[PDB]
Amino acid sequence: FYEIEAIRRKRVRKGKVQYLIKWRGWPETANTWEPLENLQSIADVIDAFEGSLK
C-alpha cells in the first residue's frame, strides 16, 4: 503493498479531518478514508526513529 497515489476528497467528521485515499495499484473501489492524524504521525515516527540513531 500500500502506497498513496492520490487524495480524491477531504471530509471533516466529529472534528477530525479524513482523506479519501486512492492507493497506487488498487482499483477505485479499494479507496479508504484515512484520518489526517494517522498520516501525519508517519513523519513524526520517522523523525523520532532517525533522531534515536544519533
Q: Which of 1, 22, 2, 19 is nearest to 10 (CA)?
A: 19
Please, is 17 exposed, middle or buried when counting C-beta atoms within 10 Å of its C-beta (0-12, 13-18, 19+)?
Answer: middle
**Which residues does residue 53 pair with via DSSP β-bridges, in sequence order?**
none
Structural Rg of the chain based on CA atoms: 14
| Domain chopping of the chain, boundaries | 1-54
Cell of residue 32, nine digits = 479508504
CA distance 49 to 51: 5
> In one letter, which amino acid is 17?
V
For this entry, resolution in Å reads: 1.7
